[PDB]
Design an enzyme around this catalytic site. Sequence first.
Site, PDB file in Angstrom:
ATOM      1  N   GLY B  39      -2.601  -9.090  13.152  1.00  0.00           N
ATOM      2  CA  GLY B  39      -3.818  -8.633  12.417  1.00  0.00           C
ATOM      3  C   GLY B  39      -3.495  -8.398  10.913  1.00  0.00           C
ATOM      4  O   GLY B  39      -2.524  -7.681  10.581  1.00  0.00           O
ATOM      5  N   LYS B  40      -4.288  -8.998  10.042  1.00  0.00           N
ATOM      6  CA  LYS B  40      -3.999  -8.945   8.617  1.00  0.00           C
ATOM      7  C   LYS B  40      -3.954  -7.503   8.058  1.00  0.00           C
ATOM      8  O   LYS B  40      -3.060  -7.184   7.260  1.00  0.00           O
ATOM      9  CB  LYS B  40      -4.977  -9.764   7.791  1.00  0.00           C
ATOM     10  CG  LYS B  40      -4.813 -11.228   8.021  1.00  0.00           C
ATOM     11  CD  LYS B  40      -5.991 -11.993   7.473  1.00  0.00           C
ATOM     12  CE  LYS B  40      -5.991 -13.477   7.896  1.00  0.00           C
ATOM     13  NZ  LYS B  40      -4.911 -14.191   7.184  1.00  0.00           N
ATOM     14  N   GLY B  41      -4.862  -6.667   8.521  1.00  0.00           N
ATOM     15  CA  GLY B  41      -4.946  -5.326   8.051  1.00  0.00           C
ATOM     16  C   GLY B  41      -3.708  -4.552   8.384  1.00  0.00           C
ATOM     17  O   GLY B  41      -3.071  -4.012   7.522  1.00  0.00           O
ATOM     18  N   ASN B  43      -0.876  -5.731   9.263  1.00  0.00           N
ATOM     19  CA  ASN B  43       0.290  -6.367   8.674  1.00  0.00           C
ATOM     20  C   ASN B  43       0.530  -5.887   7.259  1.00  0.00           C
ATOM     21  O   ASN B  43       1.668  -5.513   6.900  1.00  0.00           O
ATOM     22  CB  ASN B  43       0.169  -7.855   8.634  1.00  0.00           C
ATOM     23  CG  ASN B  43       0.334  -8.516  10.002  1.00  0.00           C
ATOM     24  OD1 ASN B  43       0.729  -7.921  11.017  1.00  0.00           O
ATOM     25  ND2 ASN B  43       0.043  -9.774  10.018  1.00  0.00           N
ATOM     26  N   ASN B 185      -4.975 -17.421  -0.641  1.00  0.00           N
ATOM     27  CA  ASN B 185      -4.103 -18.582  -0.710  1.00  0.00           C
ATOM     28  C   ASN B 185      -4.828 -19.846  -1.138  1.00  0.00           C
ATOM     29  O   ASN B 185      -6.031 -19.815  -1.444  1.00  0.00           O
ATOM     30  CB  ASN B 185      -3.326 -18.754   0.586  1.00  0.00           C
ATOM     31  CG  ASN B 185      -4.190 -19.179   1.771  1.00  0.00           C
ATOM     32  OD1 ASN B 185      -5.031 -20.061   1.702  1.00  0.00           O
ATOM     33  ND2 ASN B 185      -3.912 -18.577   2.903  1.00  0.00           N
ATOM     34  N   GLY B 226       5.302 -19.776  -5.272  1.00  0.00           N
ATOM     35  CA  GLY B 226       5.082 -18.402  -5.741  1.00  0.00           C
ATOM     36  C   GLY B 226       3.604 -18.089  -5.836  1.00  0.00           C
ATOM     37  O   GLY B 226       2.896 -18.138  -4.827  1.00  0.00           O
ATOM     38  N   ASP B 255       0.545 -11.628   4.092  1.00  0.00           N
ATOM     39  CA  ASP B 255       0.317 -10.224   4.358  1.00  0.00           C
ATOM     40  C   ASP B 255       1.434  -9.363   3.827  1.00  0.00           C
ATOM     41  O   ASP B 255       1.175  -8.294   3.300  1.00  0.00           O
ATOM     42  CB  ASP B 255       0.092  -9.991   5.841  1.00  0.00           C
ATOM     43  CG  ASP B 255      -1.171 -10.722   6.370  1.00  0.00           C
ATOM     44  OD1 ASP B 255      -2.192 -10.784   5.633  1.00  0.00           O
ATOM     45  OD2 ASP B 255      -1.150 -11.216   7.537  1.00  0.00           O
ATOM     46  N   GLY B 292       9.123 -13.483  13.307  1.00  0.00           N
ATOM     47  CA  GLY B 292       8.481 -12.393  14.023  1.00  0.00           C
ATOM     48  C   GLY B 292       7.365 -11.616  13.324  1.00  0.00           C
ATOM     49  O   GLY B 292       6.981 -10.544  13.840  1.00  0.00           O
TER      50      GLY B 292
HETATM   51  N1  AN2 Z   1       9.249 -21.018   1.505  1.00  0.00           N
HETATM   52  C1  AN2 Z   1       9.071 -19.934   0.732  1.00  0.00           C
HETATM   53  N2  AN2 Z   1      10.043 -19.523  -0.119  1.00  0.00           N
HETATM   54  C2  AN2 Z   1       9.880 -18.433  -0.895  1.00  0.00           C
HETATM   55  N3  AN2 Z   1       8.748 -17.691  -0.887  1.00  0.00           N
HETATM   56  C3  AN2 Z   1       7.702 -17.998  -0.072  1.00  0.00           C
HETATM   57  C4  AN2 Z   1       7.806 -19.168   0.808  1.00  0.00           C
HETATM   58  N4  AN2 Z   1       6.653 -19.244   1.487  1.00  0.00           N
HETATM   59  C5  AN2 Z   1       5.870 -18.213   1.080  1.00  0.00           C
HETATM   60  N5  AN2 Z   1       6.497 -17.474   0.143  1.00  0.00           N
HETATM   61  C6  AN2 Z   1       6.044 -16.235  -0.529  1.00  0.00           C
HETATM   62  O1  AN2 Z   1       5.036 -15.576   0.220  1.00  0.00           O
HETATM   63  C7  AN2 Z   1       3.777 -15.679  -0.413  1.00  0.00           C
HETATM   64  C8  AN2 Z   1       2.669 -16.139   0.546  1.00  0.00           C
HETATM   65  O2  AN2 Z   1       2.751 -17.487   1.021  1.00  0.00           O
HETATM   66  P1  AN2 Z   1       1.449 -18.108   1.732  1.00  0.00           P
HETATM   67  O3  AN2 Z   1       1.909 -19.467   2.260  1.00  0.00           O
HETATM   68  O4  AN2 Z   1       0.298 -17.904   0.725  1.00  0.00           O
HETATM   69  O5  AN2 Z   1       1.368 -17.121   3.034  1.00  0.00           O
HETATM   70  P2  AN2 Z   1       1.170 -17.522   4.614  1.00  0.00           P
HETATM   71  N6  AN2 Z   1      -0.371 -18.308   4.560  1.00  0.00           N
HETATM   72  O6  AN2 Z   1       2.403 -18.489   4.955  1.00  0.00           O
HETATM   73  O7  AN2 Z   1       1.124 -16.382   5.586  1.00  0.00           O
HETATM   74  C9  AN2 Z   1       3.989 -16.577  -1.604  1.00  0.00           C
HETATM   75  O8  AN2 Z   1       3.164 -16.077  -2.659  1.00  0.00           O
HETATM   76  C10 AN2 Z   1       5.454 -16.428  -1.880  1.00  0.00           C
HETATM   77  O9  AN2 Z   1       5.701 -15.204  -2.556  1.00  0.00           O
HETATM   78 NA    NA Z   2      -2.843 -14.248   3.771  1.00  0.00          NA
HETATM   79 NA    NA Z   3       8.673 -14.163   8.801  1.00  0.00          NA
END
Ligand code: AN2
Ligand code: NA
Ligand code: NA
Lengths: 314, 306
Positions: B39-41, B43, B185, B226, B255, B292
Amino acid sequence: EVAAVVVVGSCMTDLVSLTSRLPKTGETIHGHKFFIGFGGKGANQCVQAARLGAMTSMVCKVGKDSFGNDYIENLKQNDISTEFTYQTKDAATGTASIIVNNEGQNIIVIVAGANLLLNTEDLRAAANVISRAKVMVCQLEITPATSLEALTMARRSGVKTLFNPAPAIADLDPQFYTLSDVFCCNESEAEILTGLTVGSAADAGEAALVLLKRGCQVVIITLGAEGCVVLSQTEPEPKHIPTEKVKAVDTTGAGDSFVGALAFYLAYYPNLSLEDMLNRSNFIAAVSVQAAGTQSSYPYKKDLPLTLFLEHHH
Amino acid sequence: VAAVVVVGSCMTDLVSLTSRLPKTGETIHGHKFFIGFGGKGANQCVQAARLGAMTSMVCKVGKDSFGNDYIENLKQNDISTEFTYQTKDAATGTASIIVNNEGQNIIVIVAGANLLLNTEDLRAAANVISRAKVMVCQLEITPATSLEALTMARRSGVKTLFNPAPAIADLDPQFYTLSDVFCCNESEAEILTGLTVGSAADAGEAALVLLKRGCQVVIITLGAEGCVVLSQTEPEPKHIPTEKVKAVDTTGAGDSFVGALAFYLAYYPNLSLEDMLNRSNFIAAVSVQAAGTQSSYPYKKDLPLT
Ligand SMILES: Nc1ncnc2c1ncn2[C@@H]1O[C@H](COP(=O)(O)OP(N)(=O)O)[C@@H](O)[C@H]1O
Ligand code: NA
Ligand code: NA
Ligand SMILES: Nc1ncnc2c1ncn2[C@@H]1O[C@H](COP(=O)(O)OP(N)(=O)O)[C@@H](O)[C@H]1O
Ligand code: NA
Ligand code: NA
């Protein structure tokens, strides 16, 4: 005071999500209802038998997790002995994740989990309870070698063996046939075990004959709304037992009701004709198809006609 | 006193691993099952708490095993459950996931008790909300409830952090004007704006559309790239990259990012925005290095002192 029906087999937590369409690969969809239920063929059969009044013991293995504690509590609530219901840290309680659409079609993913870790040592501790029982009931949702050892212990002690080869595997160890006093399966299972087609009740009779000749004392094939078919070594001609037509609400777990009822009768009413047991067993299972919810649709004695618990002088 | 208040969703994740995914009418056997708290909240709340935030989770779960267990999970992360309601009328929300060996999946969400968190339930929390520093919402509860939560925070001068996830095509424009910080996102920005978002330059353009609908600040997360940020005072897109890492599991990384951001908004209000997002990128990237979801979210004690 002692348990008369012993079931060695599976407990599973059913996790069910209802949706309008089933999801395709990569899709996230929203369903409109979720529910939990207590399932697993072994526990289902045990629960029906207990609710008819049997003194029962469930030999099984669950997880040391929430689902497992809850399962134990469910068995206690139905007056089932949990003396040999084991809990383990080494795997999660068994699960069945089910997704159902509006037309009744589904996707199912079973993870047997702790049920596969019920082993030969675990059974050996139950030897006393097994040797003092009237009936021992098994299926194929635990390790085959464990069910097979259970059947062997029961035989050694003169205990009646009721074997339900479900789900069915194509190349079943033939020892299962010779250790089975009563061998009970459904139509599609009989197809897998014999390689034959089973459309009608006549076809089921022919499949049942093949299974009989592999060494079973008694063979019963369940047939949904058509009832069941029975053969024995002493009476090898197929005997079709029909059942009164009813508005089926939900047939899920009806086979487990039937088998649990059959265990009840074999244990407490050993003098009844086989034909009579199967009539009563049909009737009980048919009550279960008139309500939703698997175990919660299995009737208690108090809600059944009293003549199901009488027998005349023999 | 709680400084971060989250109004949103708790869900139980039910995950089965298989070799192949099942077709219609098929029964298949998988080789592993596991439960997780999602759950996003919750999390976002959990990440914020683990960084040291005093948090309160306003949500609704079921009067069932999954619900009791959720309450216990929140308590185990030092989250206040004062306004975590339990109801007989629906089951705790669930997310049933089936995953194959290549990582492809099928997912079925049933929001359940989450949709029964209503306006009266929020009214009782008015005191906790008005004494907070940040209020966080998403779109996994009834939209009207999130929208009232934002309105209550605004009225009391509390900073609003809104994460329009999962995204809806015809989002009420009141969400934009009630958002001090609006964070989503790439694929969510596609749905909200109707634009394509392949690159970081594209994200900048999508972010500008969202800004002009009334958000104070818009942040678009970009996975391994990023994030991108714009504000009313600095409308030119600023790309904030992040160090490359071997991603084990990115589930819930968004989250982690948003929870970290809530933490910084609440306890480090003087940091530049650019700075918050660097730190929030870093924390989220720690989370992608483990499996996890919640169990991959880092505690303060395990993070560099800065
Ligand atoms: N492979 C990766 N390497 C480094 N940082 C990562 C990454 N995948 C995601 N992130 C980090 O987590 C954030 C969220 O990624 P996003 O892909 O939007 O989240 P989600 N949809 O996988 O739960 C990014 O803004 C970045 O800070
Ligand atoms: Na998200
Ligand atoms: Na993870
Ligand atoms: N529609 C129905 N009406 C009456 N009785 C029914 C029924 N469907 C099933 N049954 C009863 O339950 C038994 C088992 O049916 P079966 O189809 O083999 O088990 P399952 N696959 O439904 O869980 C039958 O022998 C019969 O006694
Ligand atoms: Na069956
Ligand atoms: Na039923």
